[PDB]
Design an enzyme around this catalytic site. Structure first.
Site, PDB file in Angstrom:
ATOM      1  N   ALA A  25       0.797  -1.221   0.000  1.00 58.00           N
ATOM      2  CA  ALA A  25       0.000   0.000   0.000  1.00 58.00           C
ATOM      3  C   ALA A  25       0.833   1.276   0.000  1.00 58.00           C
ATOM      4  CB  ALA A  25      -0.962  -0.001   1.168  1.00 58.00           C
ATOM      5  N   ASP A 153      11.017   2.746 -14.571  1.00 49.81           N
ATOM      6  CA  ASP A 153      11.314   2.374 -13.183  1.00 49.81           C
ATOM      7  C   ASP A 153      11.729   0.908 -13.049  1.00 49.81           C
ATOM      8  OD1 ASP A 153      11.708   2.424 -10.455  1.00 49.81           O
ATOM      9  OD2 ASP A 153       9.577   2.525  -9.933  1.00 49.81           O
ATOM     10  N   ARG A 157      12.479  -4.429  -7.117  1.00 46.53           N
ATOM     11  CA  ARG A 157      11.272  -4.233  -6.323  1.00 46.53           C
ATOM     12  C   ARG A 157      10.016  -4.251  -7.195  1.00 46.53           C
ATOM     13  NH1 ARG A 157      14.208   0.385  -6.338  1.00 46.53           N
ATOM     14  NH2 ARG A 157      13.455   2.048  -7.740  1.00 46.53           N
ATOM     15  N   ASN A 158      10.195  -4.053  -8.496  1.00 48.29           N
ATOM     16  CA  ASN A 158       9.099  -4.096  -9.457  1.00 48.29           C
ATOM     17  C   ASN A 158       9.189  -5.318 -10.355  1.00 48.29           C
ATOM     18  OD1 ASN A 158       7.821  -1.679  -8.705  1.00 48.29           O
ATOM     19  ND2 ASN A 158       9.138  -0.466 -10.059  1.00 48.29           N
ATOM     20  N   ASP A 171       4.929  -2.876 -12.097  1.00 45.00           N
ATOM     21  CA  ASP A 171       5.113  -1.535 -11.553  1.00 45.00           C
ATOM     22  C   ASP A 171       4.106  -1.284 -10.427  1.00 45.00           C
ATOM     23  OD1 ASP A 171       5.678   1.130 -11.015  1.00 45.00           O
ATOM     24  OD2 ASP A 171       5.579   1.784 -13.104  1.00 45.00           O
TER      25      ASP A 171
HETATM   26  C1  LIG Z   1       3.130  -8.496  -3.498  1.00 44.94           C
HETATM   27  O1  LIG Z   1       2.709  -9.810  -3.748  1.00 44.94           O
HETATM   28  C2  LIG Z   1       2.222  -9.899  -4.986  1.00 44.94           C
HETATM   29  C3  LIG Z   1       1.711 -10.982  -5.652  1.00 44.94           C
HETATM   30  N1  LIG Z   1       1.233 -10.971  -6.901  1.00 44.94           N
HETATM   31  C4  LIG Z   1       1.296  -9.776  -7.468  1.00 44.94           C
HETATM   32  N2  LIG Z   1       0.895  -9.488  -8.723  1.00 44.94           N
HETATM   33  C5  LIG Z   1       1.117  -8.180  -8.978  1.00 44.94           C
HETATM   34  C6  LIG Z   1       1.678  -7.604  -7.871  1.00 44.94           C
HETATM   35  C7  LIG Z   1       2.086  -6.192  -7.675  1.00 44.94           C
HETATM   36  C8  LIG Z   1       1.643  -5.515  -8.916  1.00 44.94           C
HETATM   37  C9  LIG Z   1       0.313  -5.384  -9.215  1.00 44.94           C
HETATM   38  C10 LIG Z   1      -0.073  -4.766 -10.378  1.00 44.94           C
HETATM   39  C11 LIG Z   1       0.882  -4.281 -11.229  1.00 44.94           C
HETATM   40  N3  LIG Z   1       0.469  -3.667 -12.375  1.00 44.94           N
HETATM   41  C12 LIG Z   1       1.117  -2.455 -12.764  1.00 44.94           C
HETATM   42  C13 LIG Z   1       1.900  -2.765 -13.983  1.00 44.94           C
HETATM   43  C14 LIG Z   1       2.252  -1.758 -14.861  1.00 44.94           C
HETATM   44  C15 LIG Z   1       2.982  -2.056 -15.998  1.00 44.94           C
HETATM   45  C16 LIG Z   1       3.368  -3.355 -16.266  1.00 44.94           C
HETATM   46  C17 LIG Z   1       4.147  -3.645 -17.481  1.00 44.94           C
HETATM   47  F1  LIG Z   1       4.527  -2.565 -18.145  1.00 44.94           F
HETATM   48  F2  LIG Z   1       5.276  -4.292 -17.276  1.00 44.94           F
HETATM   49  F3  LIG Z   1       3.511  -4.398 -18.364  1.00 44.94           F
HETATM   50  C18 LIG Z   1       3.009  -4.358 -15.383  1.00 44.94           C
HETATM   51  C19 LIG Z   1       2.279  -4.067 -14.241  1.00 44.94           C
HETATM   52  N4  LIG Z   1       2.177  -4.392 -10.951  1.00 44.94           N
HETATM   53  C20 LIG Z   1       2.526  -5.004  -9.821  1.00 44.94           C
HETATM   54  C21 LIG Z   1       1.787  -8.633  -6.916  1.00 44.94           C
HETATM   55  C22 LIG Z   1       2.265  -8.696  -5.620  1.00 44.94           C
END
Ligand SMILES: COc1cnc2[nH]cc(Cc3ccc(NCc4ccc(C(F)(F)F)cc4)nc3)c2c1
Length: 289
Positions: A25, A153, A157-158, A171
């Site tokens: 969060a 980014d 961590r991402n 992300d």
């Molecule tokens: C912590 O434990 C977890 C377990 N599963 C999980 N799935 C996704 C997240 C975090 C998350 C959730 C959504 C998301 N979407 C944003 C995004 C933007 C851009 C891309 C891209 F560009 F790479 F395609 C991917 C994801 N990115 C990350 C997560 C965290």
């Protein structure tokens, strides 16, 4: 950029979501685990990660989440990114339904794994595992680059780990507390992950695929140090900007073979066009793994 269309193929019933624990969060957003019912072609029942705004968020945040959603729709799907499964746009707050990755981000997984291996004095990591991880994020990044898509980014961590320990680039964005995150430095108006940024991004505020390749170099460093902070102990100041501009690079990590550290150095070419393409990095890493 903002004028893309949200297709309603993705539309999902929010009443077919049962929310679990909050996975992360930020100030104005959060990612919550949920169980979706009848999701997709095969009417699967699975655990999802749902990205949403908080009550504190305002129309500005709403627009960003929507835009992000439009992009994920545009991009397409790849095994090594965090995929869009569905979205709730009608009858309430925007909810973004993505793949749930059992092991969370790569950075903690690396850090907690390392502690487990030190323990004695799942199973332990081996060099193959880091190569595979590194390889996979390259395949993922290479997929974005084919779409003229810029992450801006790239960092451990991402990068998220599903079952089978498969790495996916994502992300957290609004779901990350960057206001209190020391990996995000206050430069001017914005808060930026300076230690991961290409010199042209810092100074000229320029973001290309090659600036993402730079950030990937930092990423390799995180992986083969098992989650150390980049430029450790070094305060981001005028001296630090000058150093990067003048070709200062980190030292070889403890667990990198020299050819892997060699590829790190290539990512850190001061000239953007002299850096490797993600496909180049992929085919090389695939071979090593
Ligand atoms: C912590 O434990 C977890 C377990 N599963 C999980 N799935 C996704 C997240 C975090 C998350 C959730 C959504 C998301 N979407 C944003 C995004 C933007 C851009 C891309 C891209 F560009 F790479 F395609 C991917 C994801 N990115 C990350 C997560 C965290």
């Amino acid at each position: 950029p903002t004028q893309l269309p949200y297709n309603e193929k993705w539309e999902f019933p929010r009443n077919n979501l049962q929310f679990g624990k909050t996975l992360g969060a930020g100030a104005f957003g959060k990612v919550v685990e949920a169980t979706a019912f009848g999701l997709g072609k095969e009417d699967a029942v699975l655990k999802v990660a749902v990205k949403m705004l908080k009550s504190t968020a305002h129309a500005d945040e709403k627009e960003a989440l929507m835009s992000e959603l439009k992009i994920m729709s545009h991009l397409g799907q790849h095994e090594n990114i965090v995929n869009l499964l569905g979205a709730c746009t009608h009858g309430g707050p925007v909810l973004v339904i993505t793949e749930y990755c059992t092991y969370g981000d790569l950075l903690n997984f690396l850090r907690r794994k390392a502690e487990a291996m030190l323990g004695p004095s799942g199973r332990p990591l081996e060099l193959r595992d880091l190569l595979h991880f590194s390889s996979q994020v390259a395949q993922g990044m290479a997929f974005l680059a084919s779409k003229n898509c810029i992450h801006r980014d790239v960092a451990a961590r991402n990068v998220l780990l599903t079952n089978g320990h498969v790495a996916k680039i994502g992300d957290f964005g609004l779901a990350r507390d960057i206001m209190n995150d020391s990996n995000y430095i206050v430069k001017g108006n914005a808060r930026l992950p300076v230690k991961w940024m290409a010199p042209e991004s810092i100074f000229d505020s320029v973001y290309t695929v090659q600036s993402d390749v730079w950030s990937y170099g930092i990423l390799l460093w995180e992986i083969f140090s098992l989650g150390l902070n980049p430029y450790p102990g070094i305060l981001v100041n005028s001296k630090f900007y000058k150093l990067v501009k003048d070709g200062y690079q980190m030292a070889q990590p403890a667990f990198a073979p020299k050819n892997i550290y060699s590829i790190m150095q290539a990512c850190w070419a001061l000239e953007p066009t002299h850096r490797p393409t993600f496909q180049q990095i992929t085919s090389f890493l695939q071979e090593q793994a």
